[PDB]
């Protein structure tokens, strides 16, 4: 794995980073990138290699400022994933909300310093996620990891995350993929190397934060 | 385009079909398949070639029977896309809800004749959509097209849809894709041919329905 300081630097430069949660939790790696300047072409790559459920981790302060209510009052997800209502960008260039261009625009708009509630249409195609106030030491998830990276890198408090899947193999001429799944551990590291990205674990991110904040 | 009767037959056989809405509406093609027996490998193909936002069109009767409330009370989508709260399958084989295996399972469970509200966890990773009671003649969208195909094919009243994107081209060694977009018109037909699928327009589907029901 790469050292957390090197991951922070890459994130500060607007790159995706590959972040693995604990094997006893989801045992999954997500692509994580700062939302502020995510590009159309970057988003296309994210959609291509991920589940395609593009989420935008953000702070509680952002959910209140931008008026993004939680999707459910009785959250039945085992991990308590804090989805807000979905959004599209209210902007003249948006069309149907789903393209890489439109989803990237929604992410950039959620992160803009001048963002306001009226800048977003609800519901839509991008899924903001409310990180817990305590950060990665309080909840060891990709949502907290994204917001933590934004803080550590001095970026706007909005990230973009999605899970890296194993799309399996093409079956010539047939609408199926063979042996699909989720990318795990060593495979995630190889994925990072293939694409020139830094890769780390939430466990190491927590250890980094603890150097300054101590153990929660 | 293929004739609607041939599209219905393919859908009845559990195949994906490619359905284009009007050019003056989204001008997009979605993969549409019956939810009842969607397989892991089929879902992997769908995720690979689509936006990855896997939705499950279903009837109002299903939304009431399965207790799937609308995501928002003040729907601000221009098209009124009727998203319910998201779901995962409550089943021993589900893990994180996002894999092709898990999303396919959620779809099959939404379509099962014995489905009940307790079979689903909310929120989750599959997005049910409430078709309008009037069908494709009332709202010319992919949501209505999916439910209409289920009715026409004698299937359970739950479909699965997602938009076919243009993922652009790989950029060797870089986390970007060049020239991404949405697949349109002729490209959608070529996509169908490539994968052995039937392809049609919602306009022709409406004309088919009108043979029996007249113009709304
Ligand atoms: Zn749409
Ligand atoms: Zn849509
Ligand atoms: Zn995660
Ligand atoms: Zn994730
Ligand atoms: Zn091929
Ligand atoms: Zn997750
Ligand atoms: Zn999840
Ligand atoms: Zn559509
Ligand atoms: Zn669609
Ligand atoms: Zn390559």
Swiss-Prot record, chains A, B:
Instruction: Tell me the subunit arrangement.
Output: Homodimer.
Quote the Pfam families the UniProt record gives: DHBP_synthase (PF00926)
Q: What does this protein do?
A: Catalyzes the conversion of D-ribulose 5-phosphate to formate and 3,4-dihydroxy-2-butanone 4-phosphate.
Q: Which residues bind Mg(2+) 1?
A: 26
Q: Which family does it belong to?
A: Belongs to the DHBP synthase family.
Pathway annotation from the record: Cofactor biosynthesis; riboflavin biosynthesis; 2-hydroxy-3-oxobutyl phosphate from D-ribulose 5-phosphate: step 1/1
Question: Which reaction equations make up its catalytic activity?
Answer: D-ribulose 5-phosphate = (2S)-2-hydroxy-3-oxobutyl phosphate + formate + H(+)
Under what name is this protein listed? 3,4-dihydroxy-2-butanone 4-phosphate synthase
How is the cofactor bound here? Binds 2 divalent metal cations per subunit. Magnesium or manganese.
Q: Source organism's superkingdom?
A: Eukaryota
Q: Which organism is it from?
A: Pyricularia oryzae (strain 70-15 / ATCC MYA-4617 / FGSC 8958)
What EC numbers are recorded for this enzyme?
Answer: 4.1.99.12
Residue positions annotated to bind D-ribulose 5-phosphate are 30, 81, 139-143
Query: Which residues bind Mg(2+) 2 per the record?
Result: 26, 142
Is-annotated flag, keyword Protein transport?
A: no
- Residues that bear S-glutathionyl cysteine: 55
> Cellular component GO terms, alphabetically?
cytosol; mitochondrial intermembrane space
Q: Which InterPro entries match?
A: DHBP_synth_RibB-like_a/b_dom, DHBP_synthase_RibB
Enzyme class of the recorded protein, top EC level: lyase
Sequence positions that bind Mn(2+) 1: 26
């Amino acid at each position: 794995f790469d050292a957390i300081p090197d991951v922070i630097q890459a994130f500060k430069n607007g790159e995706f980073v590959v972040v693995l949660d604990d094997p006893s939790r989801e045992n999954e790696a997500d692509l994580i990138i700062a939302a502020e300047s995510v590009t159309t072409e970057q988003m296309a790559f994210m959609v291509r290699h991920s589940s395609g459920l593009i989420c935008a981790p953000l702070t509680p302060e952002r959910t209140t400022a931008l008026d993004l209510p939680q999707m459910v009052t009785h959250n039945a997800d085992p991990r308590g994933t804090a989805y807000t209502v979905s959004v599209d960008a209210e902007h003249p260039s948006t069309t149907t909300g789903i393209s890489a261009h439109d989803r990237a625009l929604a992410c950039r708009m959620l992160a803009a310093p001048d963002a306001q509630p009226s800048h977003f249409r609800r519901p839509g195609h991008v899924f903001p996620l409310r990180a817990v106030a305590g950060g990665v030491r309080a909840r060891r998830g990709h949502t907290e990891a994204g917001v933590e990276l934004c803080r550590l890198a001095g970026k706007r408090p909005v990230a973009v995350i999605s899970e890296i899947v194993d799309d399996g193999q093409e079956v010539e001429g047939r609408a199926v993929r063979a042996a699909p799944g989720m990318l795990r551990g060593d495979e995630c590291v190889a994925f990072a190397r293939r694409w020139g990205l830094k890769v780390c674990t939430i466990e190491d991110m927590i250890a980094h934060v603890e150097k300054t904040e101590g153990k929660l």
